[PDB]
Ligand binder design. Sequence first.
Ligand SMILES: NC(=O)c1ccc[n+]([C@@H]2O[C@H](COP(=O)([O-])OP(=O)(O)OC[C@H]3O[C@@H](n4cnc5c(N)ncnc54)[C@H](O)[C@@H]3O)[C@@H](O)[C@H]2O)c1
Ligand SMILES: NC(=O)c1ccc[n+]([C@@H]2O[C@H](COP(=O)([O-])OP(=O)(O)OC[C@H]3O[C@@H](n4cnc5c(N)ncnc54)[C@H](O)[C@@H]3O)[C@@H](O)[C@H]2O)c1
Ligand SMILES: Nc1nc2c(ncn2[C@@H]2O[C@H](COP(=O)(O)OP(=O)(O)OP(=O)(O)O)[C@@H](O)[C@H]2O)c(=O)[nH]1
Ligand SMILES: Nc1nc2c(ncn2[C@@H]2O[C@H](COP(=O)(O)OP(=O)(O)OP(=O)(O)O)[C@@H](O)[C@H]2O)c(=O)[nH]1
Ligand SMILES: Nc1nc2c(ncn2[C@@H]2O[C@H](COP(=O)(O)OP(=O)(O)OP(=O)(O)O)[C@@H](O)[C@H]2O)c(=O)[nH]1
Ligand SMILES: Nc1nc2c(ncn2[C@@H]2O[C@H](COP(=O)(O)OP(=O)(O)OP(=O)(O)O)[C@@H](O)[C@H]2O)c(=O)[nH]1
Ligand SMILES: Nc1ncnc2c1ncn2[C@@H]1O[C@H](COP(=O)(O)OP(=O)(O)OP(=O)(O)O)[C@@H](O)[C@H]1O
Ligand SMILES: Nc1ncnc2c1ncn2[C@@H]1O[C@H](COP(=O)(O)OP(=O)(O)OP(=O)(O)O)[C@@H](O)[C@H]1O
Ligand SMILES: O=c1[nH]cnc2c1ncn2[C@@H]1O[C@H](COP(=O)(O)O)[C@@H](O)[C@H]1O
Ligand SMILES: O=c1[nH]cnc2c1ncn2[C@@H]1O[C@H](COP(=O)(O)O)[C@@H](O)[C@H]1O
Ligand SMILES: O=c1[nH]cnc2c1ncn2[C@@H]1O[C@H](COP(=O)(O)O)[C@@H](O)[C@H]1O
Lengths: 484, 484, 131, 79
Amino acid sequence: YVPEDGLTAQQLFASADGLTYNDFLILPGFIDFIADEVDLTSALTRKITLKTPLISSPMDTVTEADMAIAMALMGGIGFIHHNCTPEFQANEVRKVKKFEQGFITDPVVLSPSHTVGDVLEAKMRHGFSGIPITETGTMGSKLVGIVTSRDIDFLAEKDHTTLLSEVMTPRIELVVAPAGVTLKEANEILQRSKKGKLPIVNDCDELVAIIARTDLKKNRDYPLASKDSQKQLLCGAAVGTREDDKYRLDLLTQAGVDVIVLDSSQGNSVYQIAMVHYIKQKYPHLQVIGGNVVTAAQAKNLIDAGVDGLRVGMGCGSICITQEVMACGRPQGTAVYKVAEYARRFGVPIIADGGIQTVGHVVKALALGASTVMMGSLLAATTEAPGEYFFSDGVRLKKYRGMGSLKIAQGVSGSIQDKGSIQKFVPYLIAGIQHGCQDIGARSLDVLRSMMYSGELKFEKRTMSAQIEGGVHGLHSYTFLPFT
Amino acid sequence: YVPEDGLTAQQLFASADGLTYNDFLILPGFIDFIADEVDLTSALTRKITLKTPLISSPMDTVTEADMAIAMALMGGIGFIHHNCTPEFQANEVRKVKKFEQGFITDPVVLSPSHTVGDVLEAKMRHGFSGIPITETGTMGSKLVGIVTSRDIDFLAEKDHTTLLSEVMTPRIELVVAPAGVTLKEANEILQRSKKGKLPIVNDCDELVAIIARTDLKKNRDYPLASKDSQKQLLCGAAVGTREDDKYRLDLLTQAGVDVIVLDSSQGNSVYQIAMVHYIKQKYPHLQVIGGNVVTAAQAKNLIDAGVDGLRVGMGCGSICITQEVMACGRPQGTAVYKVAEYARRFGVPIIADGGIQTVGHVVKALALGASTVMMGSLLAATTEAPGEYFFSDGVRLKKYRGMGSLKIAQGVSGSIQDKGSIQKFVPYLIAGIQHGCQDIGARSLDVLRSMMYSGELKFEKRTMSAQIEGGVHGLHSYTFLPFT
Amino acid sequence: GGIQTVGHVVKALALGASTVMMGSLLAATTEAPGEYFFSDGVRLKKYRGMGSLKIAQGVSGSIQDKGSIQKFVPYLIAGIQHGCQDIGARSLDVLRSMMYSGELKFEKRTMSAQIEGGVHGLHSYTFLPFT
Amino acid sequence: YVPEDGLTAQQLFASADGLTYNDFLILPGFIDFIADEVDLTSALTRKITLKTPLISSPMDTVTEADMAIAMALMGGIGF
Ligand SMILES: NC(=O)c1ccc[n+]([C@@H]2O[C@H](COP(=O)([O-])OP(=O)(O)OC[C@H]3O[C@@H](n4cnc5c(N)ncnc54)[C@H](O)[C@@H]3O)[C@@H](O)[C@H]2O)c1
Ligand SMILES: NC(=O)c1ccc[n+]([C@@H]2O[C@H](COP(=O)([O-])OP(=O)(O)OC[C@H]3O[C@@H](n4cnc5c(N)ncnc54)[C@H](O)[C@@H]3O)[C@@H](O)[C@H]2O)c1
Ligand SMILES: Nc1nc2c(ncn2[C@@H]2O[C@H](COP(=O)(O)OP(=O)(O)OP(=O)(O)O)[C@@H](O)[C@H]2O)c(=O)[nH]1
Ligand SMILES: Nc1nc2c(ncn2[C@@H]2O[C@H](COP(=O)(O)OP(=O)(O)OP(=O)(O)O)[C@@H](O)[C@H]2O)c(=O)[nH]1
Ligand SMILES: Nc1nc2c(ncn2[C@@H]2O[C@H](COP(=O)(O)OP(=O)(O)OP(=O)(O)O)[C@@H](O)[C@H]2O)c(=O)[nH]1
Ligand SMILES: Nc1nc2c(ncn2[C@@H]2O[C@H](COP(=O)(O)OP(=O)(O)OP(=O)(O)O)[C@@H](O)[C@H]2O)c(=O)[nH]1
Ligand SMILES: Nc1ncnc2c1ncn2[C@@H]1O[C@H](COP(=O)(O)OP(=O)(O)OP(=O)(O)O)[C@@H](O)[C@H]1O
Ligand SMILES: Nc1ncnc2c1ncn2[C@@H]1O[C@H](COP(=O)(O)OP(=O)(O)OP(=O)(O)O)[C@@H](O)[C@H]1O
Ligand SMILES: O=c1[nH]cnc2c1ncn2[C@@H]1O[C@H](COP(=O)(O)O)[C@@H](O)[C@H]1O
Ligand SMILES: O=c1[nH]cnc2c1ncn2[C@@H]1O[C@H](COP(=O)(O)O)[C@@H](O)[C@H]1O
Ligand SMILES: O=c1[nH]cnc2c1ncn2[C@@H]1O[C@H](COP(=O)(O)O)[C@@H](O)[C@H]1O
């Protein structure tokens, strides 16, 4: 027999003293496994599951098309901000969705009568090189040939008037697959064909769809990417709660959004509940994420309205000044614990929103019940963030401002310190998270939360001196160098 | 008639007051042309000419294979440092040379009896994907087939034992060109072939050489690259003046160095002159660059020894502490002017070495007679610089230390502030240089120096208050944001 | 007085001074009188002028520790002889002969070259003389 | 023939502008020898000669018996 040490989560938060991420620790356990065995699959909404617990917040300083793509390629997800025109946001969503497609049912096509100028224009506009050619120049017509970049490289920049009929590979020479073939078999006939495209045709011999080799190359290159049933990246977008956001929502849903995150400082309001009802009534197949909530009472009515996933955290963001504009707020540790313990019964996952500044906080938030963790400032200065770097005091920086920072300024605008590529940063966050889980002794995140709720995971309250002692405190100067 | 204003160069430097880059200006002239018309072709040695005036200094914190490639791809050149093993430096030189080749006379080949594991190993080791296959597995044998990446992608990671005979395209199907064909015609048969390779063969039907499409793609992508007669990048390397550097020089010359830069703090010495003579005696086809010199007398004996190009500047580097270890030195403006005016008669170009910190200094050094300008600190923290970034005080930095900074420390070690890609930084330097030349009114750099020597380009001496006034002085805080 | 670097040690020997007297460089070496004391996370030895105190003609300060004299002086000698070598002088007598005969030629250094003559482009740095 | 560069000492100090150690340099020359061949014997007085040019100043914060010994052991002297 060995004495019990530490306080269970319910015992630590029973005092109602207002703890946060920096005021407690997790006592370590046992290791019977290697860190890489840790499984990080985390639920985002009741019908969406991610292969990593990391999300990017919807703001005008993060989550462009580039950041959304770079996040979706590592299992996470990206929420495009709504501080922009409805058609601009829909364009960004379409751009994120059209990255890898499989069956491309709406490609770019042309006709023999077109000219090399047309293929060059299509290239310069979209980036798609391959262009199937059809009699009429649309899908509902017989296939004639395909023109790609390798057919345009050797031109002399003065024969652009040449008709595409003189550069396409004729239909008789193409390799195609009959319509109705499953993707697996289509990928097989593409690979054994050892070529770059397969324009699918039917018994009538007219183009129906097309497949590309670089798509399966990307699949082989990024095993952890997040995709829907059509083998294309998942994308999210934020929306307000005005009567004029219905048009924006319609535009987004036509663009192909998968999950919508209602965006407000406080979720508890008739205005938000009405839009949740509207979304569930007009788009029954769309996943909606509730607004900011910090309380069980603040959640109950949103869950009743029909939110598929909640977003917990208010007044806590590294840019948020709600706690000073108004007196309202709640420390993030208490908020996460006391909205997750209530939400677990109805099966609605939670998103620990704001306040994350280190892998320690990323693992703490995942320990307290948050299925996934949303993160705005850490990803603020990565290469994928929108904007262009600028040199402030002998250092290149990217601006970082809250989306409501400006009648009243609820936020602040600042600068962050450059971090390199998201595709090279996220793996380090994943490695740190799984190392922390290993040290705790958790086979996975679901087990990590099971240990907490059953009482097996025991915390200890950290005083101020231990908070200072918990960092680096005895050095004259130093450097960090995370591997990233 | 309008009065003459300003001091010619000879009038400005006649006072022997020890001016530098910050103590004078160039009065502006007339504009009858657009900036982009400025031609920046600059001589490096008596038999090497560059399409840009920028060089990277040989140091252990710059000019790796990556930086040398990134510089050679923009017209400049890169000098690989000699603070490394002879075989390591030779490997770096060979790596820089084997970037784009045209006729690849020593490719990687294999034989039917090999296995897919062999092609995968060659890929993982070198990076070359295409591998012509021959009966014996060497050049002196009949060609049988070629295996590339598109023939290996669809394998299942468990049939690696498969013989390459089951994946190569057989000789009967290949497209080849007869031996003795000129490169232009070979490139033509490659482009009209609309295919990725041409393994050259002779009347005996055995492999002699091979060409690649990505090489001419790079040629089309980088019009300003610097290459020798064999269509591969120029590379330079530094060497010491000991009796044991002969082996290093032999290894480098076998690796294919084009220009050698004798590396010493002071060039005037029997030890340096003896190695200049040795190089000219054993490698008559090699361009050698003299050591650091600051005086006409200091140059005369090196020119007599046979230096093909001089390197002017001593005690001036942003990291150099020679002026404090010893009393010797000379301000860079006076040194450049008074070693270029002497060197012009013998036709030996000059390299303004050290002290450059801005495009203003880059254009000042080119105005005073320096055919090309060598630059170590500006390129110090770019992505291509050797080493990995590290976070010091909320900012990621790359170390920058002088190659002699450590019996006695003649240098210092510090940090620099990250600058992004060389391929994205050098174009901004070129644009700034040509804008300055345009403002002066010079059609090109040769005209810019002609105006100075003839007296048409007139400077003015800048006092301390104008030095402060010449910058930014009235702002509380600010940002720069160069386009780069 | 006024010597602060091997550069000044060689400059003073170039201008005619047969030998050079030096007070501050040797101030904090282990052999200096007194005991080290920690001021701001650093152990230092006091350094004050002998007339620093009716009237104070001097000042009292602190210096930064330098290790043994027997391990410091050889580095000064090595630096001096390296500077003489770079000048091209077989010895100090020859170094002064060249100056008086006119063979040793100086150049006047302006303020910008004084800044340029040091370390000026680094964010932070370290020196580490071998000593 | 190679032009003369720089100012002799008498030419540099003729201006009576008040130069110091930080306001001038020595232009470099030629090397036909190794550094260790440099001989540093320096005269201290008319009847005393030292093997190094370094002296320690007489002050209450330097030149005790220990510093005088440590200096005399390297050719110099201690006051
Ligand atoms: N998560 C955080 O910590 C946090 C906090 C504050 C702000 N923010 C960010 O700033 C943005 C702005 O926040 P906000 O709360 O000021 O904006 P908001 O639109 O969510 O709320 C501001 C006001 O809008 C009103 N409103 C909403 N719908 C309405 C309707 N249909 N009719 C009439 N009035 C209506 C509300 O009553 C409220 O007074 C958020 O969308 C979010 O991106 C985040
Ligand atoms: N350009 C600058 O401002 C500058 C200044 C100082 C140092 N540096 C860098 O630091 C490096 C080191 O400079 P350094 O002058 O100390 O090194 P170096 O080898 O060039 O000279 C140092 C010593 O080597 C001796 N030496 C050279 N060849 C010899 C031989 N064959 N036999 C005997 N002795 C020989 C010289 O006599 C001299 O005393 C340089 O190569 C350069 O990269 C640059
Ligand atoms: N054309 C095409 N095929 C794809 C794409 N992504 C996956 N596939 C194919 O669809 C199947 C997906 O199974 P896996 O290869 O295991 O892919 P994965 O890494 O599990 O990725 P997911 O299946 O999305 O979880 C295989 O036949 C893939 O080759 C894509 O973007 N385009
Ligand atoms: N830009 C663009 N990409 C599309 C479009 N539709 C599908 N894609 C996908 O984007 C990629 C476009 O591939 P291509 O531009 O043909 O690529 P490529 O010419 O083979 O060149 P690389 O793949 O880059 O070597 C594929 O992954 C397509 O599935 C479209 O309309 N525009
Ligand atoms: N195979 C091959 N051919 C090349 C390469 N570089 C240039 N060429 C060809 O050689 C000739 C070079 O002439 P240009 O096309 O004008 O090239 P450039 O931009 O002037 O480059 P340089 O000729 O090196 O100055 C053309 O036939 C090119 O296609 C290369 O790396 N590989
Ligand atoms: N790594 C490597 N490159 C070589 C070698 N010899 C020549 N090269 C050049 O390096 C490039 C190698 O091209 P590959 O690796 O075949 O390129 P690829 O498979 O066509 O793929 P991408 O060109 O990157 O789309 C060409 O520019 C060659 O000319 C070698 O031995 N190793
Ligand atoms: N399905 C197909 N059947 C027959 N020929 C095809 C097919 N797809 C492409 N081609 C032809 O093959 C050649 C190049 O095909 P590929 O797909 O490699 O082009 P690409 O991918 O744009 O080349 P690159 O690697 O330069 O981007 C062209 O002649 C093109 O018309
Ligand atoms: N000269 C040639 N003649 C005939 N077939 C060739 C020739 N060169 C390559 N191939 C074949 O063409 C196919 C792919 O050629 P390609 O040069 O596009 O490969 P790759 O450049 O490695 O492709 P990727 O774009 O994926 O890198 C393979 O079947 C290869 O064996
Ligand atoms: O202007 C703003 N005011 C207040 N909160 C904001 C503002 N913009 C974004 N936020 C939120 O602040 C959090 C930012 O996460 P962080 O990385 O902890 O700063 C997220 O919840 C954002 O949605
Ligand atoms: O350790 C060193 N001491 C002195 N000079 C150095 C050292 N390393 C490099 N240098 C030179 O200092 C110059 C650096 O250029 P910068 O960019 O002006 O610093 C070049 O001449 C380098 O060759
Ligand atoms: O109290 C003082 N006032 C003024 N000069 C002093 C005093 N003490 C020492 N000195 C002199 O100042 C010089 C010190 O050399 P330093 O190393 O250049 O400071 C020597 O000439 C000392 O003799």
